[PDB]
């Protein structure tokens, strides 16, 4: 039993730019094995990242346990990946 | 503009009247309901007059009100129904001098409709249940219980509704330490409205249905249903158990029928009319009240017909069955809505048209020289009972409460050449009509 809005990929907004890849791998790997993690390296996409997990239940448990996580001095938000919302800039 | 309406003189025409120990002492008290006002009077036997002790405004139309005493208690609670769909059981407090609402059970919508209960309210003589029936296709039965803090509690109301069945009257049969039974004169209007020939409306007379509320099953079902040869107008319950013939007699146009089921036969008795009065060419005469009384020796009923001849009827029965019904013309009384016969020889008649009376019983029974009749007398050719008119000889008038309710005409005039104006109005209906001039001064 899982809603269809959840997926294997999860987006993160308003992330600190000084965060390293090891801290992001430790924060994403707490709920399960993380398959891939892509951080933005653009001024128009700064503060956002995409973490794709190997399991759907592990990705749902990671998305349920990352909305409003304690980080550096910004308000980061974790949301589900959408095809129509990610390509809104094009 | 914004106006304000106040009440200068209260309503005096009493619609309903009951009697009982509402204060909780050895003396009795009368409770009158004038539709929108509830008053309490104390029939003091020392002076003989009636003195009001409390008067409240119910802000509605009281259709029924009855006082009932619980099992093993001294105070009697008054259960009243109004235009709203809620029955209110209250108790009179002598210390606070007010009517404290003990319980209010809502079981219907507001307005004086035929689906909302509140028209007929019957109570058991033991004080175990209360039946509230509407005009048609609505009935409920509440169970009163005694909580160990000397409290009165109301249970869930039962469902005893029957579709296409109108109810004219309802009463509660006396049952000593048994299940409470409610007897009602029901009338089925399904065949009278489904047949367009018109002949079905002439063979649709009322039938007495007695429903016994089962306390073990927590439901109400119709126990017995017996048809009647005449259309009943009212019902009168007789005390039973360790008393005698428990039953419910039915009154009709020159007819009184004892129809206790089980083993007793239906005993019919015509009402004794006048001797040579030219007042009924082809019309009959029905009863208006019951006024049951018991002085711990026997039981009697002070019935009142449409003319006003108050008759004391006493039923002589056997140890188990009813033998015959006897009646005799006791005295002459004005037309009243309800009579409240209290203890120590007191009879209060609350006339709906005219003044109210409070008399003292001097010669109870009067079975010495009056030509009394009986239901077992082999009389033919109609009723064959011609009673002679006579003045008041068994009761003497003690108190006369002025009740000018029928104030149809009213004019404010100063024809008496005084400072303050006066009001000339009318009172009474028919022969009891009178022109009354009222002033603001004292007598």
């Amino acid at each position: 039993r899982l809603p269809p809005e959840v997926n294997r990929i999860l987006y993160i907004r308003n992330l600190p730019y000084k965060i390293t890849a090891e801290e992001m791998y430790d924060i994403f790997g707490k709920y399960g094995p993380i398959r891939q993690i892509r951080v933005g390296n653009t001024p128009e996409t700064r503060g956002t990242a995409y973490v794709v997990y190997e399991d759907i239940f592990d990705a749902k448990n990671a998305c349920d346990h990352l909305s409003g996580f304690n980080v550096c001095n910004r308000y980061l938000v974790v949301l589900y990946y959408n095809a129509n919302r990610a390509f809104q800039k094009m | 503009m914004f106006l304000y309406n106040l009440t200068l003189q209260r309503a005096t025409g009493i619609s309903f009247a009951i009697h009982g120990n509402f204060s909780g002492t050895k003396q009795q008290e009368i409770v009158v309901s004038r539709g929108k006002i509830l008053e309490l009077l104390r029939p003091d036997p020392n002076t003989g007059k009636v003195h009001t002790l409390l008067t409240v405004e119910v802000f509605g139309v009281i259709r029924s009100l009855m006082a009932f005493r619980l099992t093993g208690g001294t105070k009697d609670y008054i259960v009243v129904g109004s235009d709203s769909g809620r029955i209110v059981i209250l108790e009179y407090q002598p210390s606070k001098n007010m009517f404290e609402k003990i319980h209010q059970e809502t079981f219907g919508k507001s307005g004086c409709r035929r689906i909302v209960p509140g028209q007929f309210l019957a109570v058991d003589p033991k004080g175990r249940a209360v039946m509230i029936s509407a005009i048609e296709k609505q009935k409920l039965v509440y169970i009163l219980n005694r909580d160990a803090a000397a409290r009165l509690t109301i249970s869930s109301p039962l469902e005893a509704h029957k579709a296409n069945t109108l109810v004219y009257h309802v009463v509660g049969v006396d049952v000593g330490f048994e299940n409470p039974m409610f007897a009602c004169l029901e009338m089925d209007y399904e065949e009278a409205d489904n047949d367009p020939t018109g002949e079905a409306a002439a063979n649709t007379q009322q039938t007495l249905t007695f429903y016994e509320l089962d306390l073990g099953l927590n439901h109400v079902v119709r126990k017995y249903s017996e048809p009647l040869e005449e259309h009943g107008n009212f019902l009168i319950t007789v005390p039973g158990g360790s008393d005698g013939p428990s039953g419910v007699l039915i009154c009709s146009e020159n007819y009184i029928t004892y129809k206790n089921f089980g083993d007793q036969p239906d005993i019919r008795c015509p009402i004794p009319r006048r001797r040579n009065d030219l007042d009924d060419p082809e019309r009959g005469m029905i009863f208006v009240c019951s006024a049951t009384h018991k002085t711990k020796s026997m039981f009697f009923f002070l019935a009142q017909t449409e003319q006003g001849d108050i008759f004391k009827i006493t039923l002589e029965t056997d140890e188990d069955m009813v033998t015959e019904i006897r009646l005799k013309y006791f005295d002459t009384v004005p037309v009243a809505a309800a009579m409240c016969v209290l203890k120590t020889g007191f009879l209060f008649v609350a006339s709906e048209f005219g003044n109210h009376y409070l008399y003292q019983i001097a010669h109870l029974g009067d079975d010495d020289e009056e030509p009394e009749f009986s239901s077992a007398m082999p009389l033919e050719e109609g009723d064959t009972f011609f009673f002679q008119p006579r003045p008041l000889k068994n009761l003497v008038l003690v108190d006369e409460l002025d009740s000018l309710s029928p104030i149809l005409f009213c004019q404010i005039a100063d024809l008496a050449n005084e400072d303050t104006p006066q009001l000339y109005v009318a009172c009474g209906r028919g022969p009891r009509s009178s022109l009354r001039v009222l002033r603001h001064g004292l007598e």
Binding site: R38 | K109, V116, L217
Partner: protein
């Protein structure tokens, strides 16, 4: 499908630029069909080619094709297929629909969602196919038979609703004729399903409607299987409808008394189960009902042993509170030895029946506490307090209920002295059951009987159960909170020993341990103010002020809840984490995407706006009011109810001049659950502050050329009128031209909002002399009752019900006049519905407002009683 592994190209194609890495298609646009489901939709892979080769049944293939949109298609496509099959159920017929739905639901490779969609399609096509599925009643009953015995409660409820709809549509004779050969079947599960379906049909169609058929089925002596099925149907009807069975108890008892006398033990056990079930329902306290039944039950319980004796003991324990005090005292004095002898029974069902009967055997007078503590409680502690009883839920809940009944009857101290040794065990389920029993004993009885020699041991056991928790259950924290509430001032040498444990558990590698410590601090926050502990609460608040850096959001929400509980238990302006250094600290915490953490942050912001509004310089509130508009549109229904109260508190504190402009600017968003929340917040701000100051501004949002902004302004005005009520008599003349202009618009939503605002103004200003505006609005709302939308029709019905109570039933009868005998039936039905609503609203008021009707030739209709005058 959702857990399938993907390649690198599919992962790179779903990501935008600017990121650094650290035939098989049936007729075109149909969804993908399963390889095992190519049998029911085999006629859809080929082309239709409708040219003199199209029978009617091929259109039934279209009824399969929409089923292809209903099984595994899109949810808008499934909604369109359901709308096409519901509106055309009469034209397609129930025959081919049942013939296409019967092998689809009986497939061995189905799923739960497909079965739920098939049950919803069968229930939705049951309202239009009334009195037509009587030959297809058996084919639907054979598919709905395993749905009632399923594991899920929702599927069982849907099957019971489908069985009730089939019993209401097929009547009583067809259901009795269809279930008549299904009673003497060889399969026991099919016979039990048929008995459950017959019990559901008897519950949905009335007890005397199936009572003589059940009496004839139970009184027939041909086989034991039919009598067992009838007894099982009677037991299911007694267990389904407790209240309904009670009246039928006498009858049901007369049929159940004929059983339990034959040579078959299964029929006697079924009759004993029906009598137990009956006692529970029919004639709950009807000892007389069990009168003629109490005599063979004691003989069967004393002369034989086994499952039948256990069923007779369960029936005696169920009927023992339904008797008098002397009868229960006589029954309890002869059944305690049989209950003590059956304590060593190896069967689980007999042990469960004994544990269920022991709770009812000691529930009143007659049973002494000393004998129950000497000869009943040591065998109940030695035979039932095991590790295998905590595995099953039915064996644990009944044991906890029996322990609570033994603690309420004998004493709480004697149960606390024997239940404290299992609090430090190695099993989680037994420790959770012991903690739940201790919480029930503390809630029902209390902790007054516990002395000083056992309270410290109980506190140590509760601390060992809370510190060694492995699951996410809130039973241990609730038990510790109930124990702290039962202790009160007796836990005064226990607050440092709990604080040193909470401070140690707040710093750990796990994430659930800090959340459990914060939940335990929040549950024990009310016990510190009543024990004169102010420095410890201040130290806990100063620790929790810096404990907001926990990366787990479930721990951060629990820390915010603990901070809110510490701020509620203590003073608002007397906290060592003051409001001057916490309200800017919670301003980045309110932008969380979680549900519970954002709800706790919104509750803390509302509490800080209600009790600490004088701790800011009127600058952070205007910045937090713009962030409060993003806290809505959440699927939790908790933050949206607190954000409106927080906006109303901010408008009451800082003045309703800044939040009203933000609420008007946020009304144009074109999104669901975002415009109604801002309108409700504006209505709450207008009801908390003066409604006149927001009176012209609400007239300004209707001036903008926008439909959504005008609809939101009308909804805000209607909500403000509904929140005001009697205070809307002064704002009726300002809203009367807006309601007159909004009802003349072409959009039906604006007309429905104007009708709702008129209904709110009628229900609020009823009895104040404002009948002129109501009569003016009723002239415009009267053409709005002929709409085709159900929402606009419901709004017009609400406006009519408001105008009949405000302007009077006479004006409602005059407006509905000359419409009951109308030629057009589409208006005559609406006029009859309005007349029925006016009669249900006020029936006695229609007597004086009735028009004069002349008398006919055969019948008379002139009221001669009211026409006479004195």
């Amino acid at each position: 499908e959702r857990n399938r592994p993907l390649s690198d190209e599919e992962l790179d194609a779903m990501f935008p630029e600017g990121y650094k890495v650290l035939n098989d298609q049936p007729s075109g646009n149909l969804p993908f069909l399963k390889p095992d489901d190519i049998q029911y939709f085999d006629k859809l892979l080929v082309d239709v080619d409708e040219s003199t080769l199209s029978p009617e049944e091929q259109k039934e293939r279209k009824i399969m094709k929409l089923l292809l949109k209903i099984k595994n298609g899109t949810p808008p496509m499934r909604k369109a297929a359901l709308r096409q099959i519901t509106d055309k159920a009469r034209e397609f017929g129930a025959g081919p629909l049942f013939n296409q739905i019967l092998p689809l639901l009986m497939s061995p490779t189905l799923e739960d969602q497909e079965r739920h969609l098939l049950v919803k399609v069968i229930d939705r096509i049951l309202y239009k196919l009334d009195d037509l599925v009587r030959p297809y009643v058996h084919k639907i009953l054979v598919v709905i038979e395993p749905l009632l015995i399923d594991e899920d409660y929702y599927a069982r409820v849907e099957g019971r609703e489908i069985i009730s709809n089939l019993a209401k549509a097929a009547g009583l004779a067809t259901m009795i004729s269809t279930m008549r050969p299904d009673i003497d079947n060889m399969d026991e599960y099919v016979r039990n399903t048929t008995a459950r379906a017959f019990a559901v049909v008897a519950s949905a169609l009335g007890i005397p409607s199936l009572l003589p058929f059940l009496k004839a089925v139970c009184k027939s002596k041909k086989s034991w299987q039919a009598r067992h099925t009838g007894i099982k149907i009677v037991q299911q009807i007694a267990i389904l409808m407790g209240c309904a069975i009670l009246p039928h108890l006498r009858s049901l008892v007369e049929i159940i008394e004929h059983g339990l006398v034959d040579e078959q033990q299964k029929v006697r056990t079924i009759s004993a189960l029906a009598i137990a079930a009956l006692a529970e329902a029919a004639t709950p306290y009807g000892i007389e009902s069990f009168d003629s039944v109490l005599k063979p039950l004691w003989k069967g319980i004393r002369q034989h042993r086994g499952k039948g004796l256990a069923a007779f003991l369960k029936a005696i324990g169920y009927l023992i509170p339904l008797m008098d005090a002397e009868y229960a005292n006589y029954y309890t004095r002869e059944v305690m030895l049989i209950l003590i002898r059956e304590f060593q029974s190896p069967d689980e069902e007999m042990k469960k029946i004994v544990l269920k009967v022991v709770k009812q055997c000691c529930g009143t007078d007659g049973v002494e506490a000393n004998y129950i503590k000497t000869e009943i409680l040591p065998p109940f502690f030695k035979h039932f307090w095991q590790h295998r009883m905590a595995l099953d839920r039915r064996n644990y809940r009944q044991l906890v209920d029996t322990t609570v009944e033994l603690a309420n009857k004998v004493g709480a101290a004697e149960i606390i002295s024997r239940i404290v040794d299992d609090l430090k065990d190695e099993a989680e389920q037994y420790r959770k059951m012991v903690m739940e029993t201790i919480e029930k004993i503390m809630g029902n009885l209390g902790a007054a009987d516990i002395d000083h020699k056992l309270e410290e041991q109980l506190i140590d056991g509760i601390l060992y159960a809370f510190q060694e928790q492995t699951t996410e259950d809130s039973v241990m924290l609730n038990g510790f909170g109930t124990v702290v509430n039962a202790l009160g001032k007796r836990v005064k040498p226990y607050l440092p020993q709990i604080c040193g444990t909470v401070l140690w558990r707040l710093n750990n590698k796990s994430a659930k341990v800090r959340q459990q410590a914060a939940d335990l601090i929040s549950r024990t926050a009310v016990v510190m103010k009543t024990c004169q502990e102010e420095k410890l609460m201040g130290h806990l608040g100063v620790v929790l002020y810096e404990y907001l850096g926990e990366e787990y959001p479930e721990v951060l929400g629990s820390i915010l809840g603990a901070l809110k509980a510490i701020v509620n238990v203590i003073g608002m302006h007397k906290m060592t984490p003051p409001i001057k250094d916490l309200l800017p600290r919670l301003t980045p915490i309110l932008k969380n995407r979680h549900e519970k953490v954002q709800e706790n942050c919104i509750d803390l912001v509302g509490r800080i706006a209600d009790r600490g509004a004088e701790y800011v310089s009127a600058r952070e509130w205007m910045r937090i009011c713009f962030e409060l508009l993003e806290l809505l549109k959440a699927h939790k229904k908790a933050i949206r109810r607190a954000t409106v109260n927080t906006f109303g508190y901010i408008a009451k504190a800082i003045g309703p001049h800044d939040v009203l402009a933000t609420l008007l600017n946020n009304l144009k968003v074109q999104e669901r659950q975002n415009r109604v929340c801002t309108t409700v917040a504006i209505a709450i701000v207008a009801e908390t502050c003066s409604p006149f100051t927001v009176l012209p501004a609400l007239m300004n949002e209707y001036r903008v050329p926008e439909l959504n902004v005008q609809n939101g302004v009308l909804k805000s005005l209607s909500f403000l009128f509904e929140y005001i009520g009697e205070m809307g008599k002064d704002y009726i003349y300002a809203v009367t031209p807006l309601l007159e202009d909004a009802l003349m618009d072409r959009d039906l939503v604006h007309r429905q909002t104007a009708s709702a605002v008129v209904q709110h103004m009628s229900l609020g200003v009823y009895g104040f002399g404002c009948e002129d505006s109501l009569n003016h609005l009723l002239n415009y709302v009267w053409p709005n009752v002929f709409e085709t939308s159900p929402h606009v029709i419901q709004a017009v019905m609400g406006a009519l019900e408001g105008l009949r109570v405000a302007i009077g039933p006479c004006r409602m009868l005059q407006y509905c006049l000359q419409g009951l005998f109308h030629p057009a039936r589409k208006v005559r039905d609406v006029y009859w519905k309005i007349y029925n609503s006016i009669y249900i609203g006020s029936q006695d008021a229609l007597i004086a407002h009735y028009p004069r009707i002349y008398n006919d030739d055969k019948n008379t209709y002139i009221r001669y009683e009211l026409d006479y005058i004195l």
